[PDB]
């Protein structure tokens, strides 16, 4: 009820904002106005060619990092258990392993940029 | 300071939960009658 009402209201207001923005101002298009911006001169011509960025290795590791942040999120409810001895050991395992994965990721180059 | 306050909040939670469990038998005593009453009305009407 309330949550999607809040969600619906927000997208509606945004839609009107772009609607009056994109319609009202008395457009005048003459092709070169719509031409791509290339810092004053013409584009060399591409912008969809494969932009080979050099942080590929750090990219996937972030995915693996997030997969285990979801694992360590139930800690606030995990602390309210009757077996903190087991819960503390297994909890510290994740951070030790996460540091260990980063440590290998760090020491064997990894984090460093590709040049 | 947090360690004192958190324990005080724990003290309240048992106090809150104790009031919950003491009141609980009445809540269970109402629920069964409503569901039995609801099951009946469906079944009495089910004959029709």
């Amino acid at each position: 009820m309330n949550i999607m009402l809040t969600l619906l209201t927000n997208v509606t207001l945004a839609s009107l904002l772009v609607l009056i923005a994109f319609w009202l101002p008395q457009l005048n298009a003459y092709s070169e106005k719509t031409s791509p911006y290339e810092c004053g001169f013409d584009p060399m011509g591409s912008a969809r060619l494969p932009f080979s960025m050099k942080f590929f290795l750090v990219a996937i590791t972030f995915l693996l990092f997030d997969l285990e942040i979801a694992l360590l999120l139930p800690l606030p409810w995990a602390s309210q258990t009757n077996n903190l001895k087991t819960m503390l050991t297994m909890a510290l395992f994740l951070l030790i392993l996460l540091a260990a994965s980063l440590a290998y990721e760090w020491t064997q180059k990894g984090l460093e940029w590709a040049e | 300071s947090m360690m004192k306050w958190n324990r005080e909040r724990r003290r309240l939670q048992i106090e809150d939960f104790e009031a919950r469990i003491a009141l609980m038998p009445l809540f269970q005593a109402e629920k069964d009658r409503r569901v039995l009453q609801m099951l009946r009305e469906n079944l009495e009407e089910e004959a029709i």
Partner: protein, 83 residues
């Protein structure tokens, strides 16, 4: 000895971040065992009742459990009230 202390000093100079993380990270593993309140922490978790203390039938020979939630006999937690 001298090499170990120098390596700590060389670390503390070259990098203050991981040594600080390693130090406070190292403590977070050890003192939980040495802490004298960890046995109290589990007791607090056990004390907090989330489900009902379902009563049990009498047949005699049961002095430990009380017949009324005011009787002196039974598990009492005045330790936690002062704690």
């Amino acid at each position: 000895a001298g090499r170990i202390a120098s390596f700590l000093k060389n670390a503390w100079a070259k990098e203050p971040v991981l040594v600080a993380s390693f130090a406070i990270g190292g403590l977070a593993i050890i003192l939980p065992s040495l802490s004298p309140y960890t046995n109290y922490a589990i007791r607090i978790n056990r004390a907090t009742p989330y489900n009902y203390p379902v009563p049990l039938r009498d047949d005699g020979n049961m002095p430990d459990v009380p017949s009324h939630p005011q009787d002196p006999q039974g598990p009492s937690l005045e330790w936690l009230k002062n704690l």
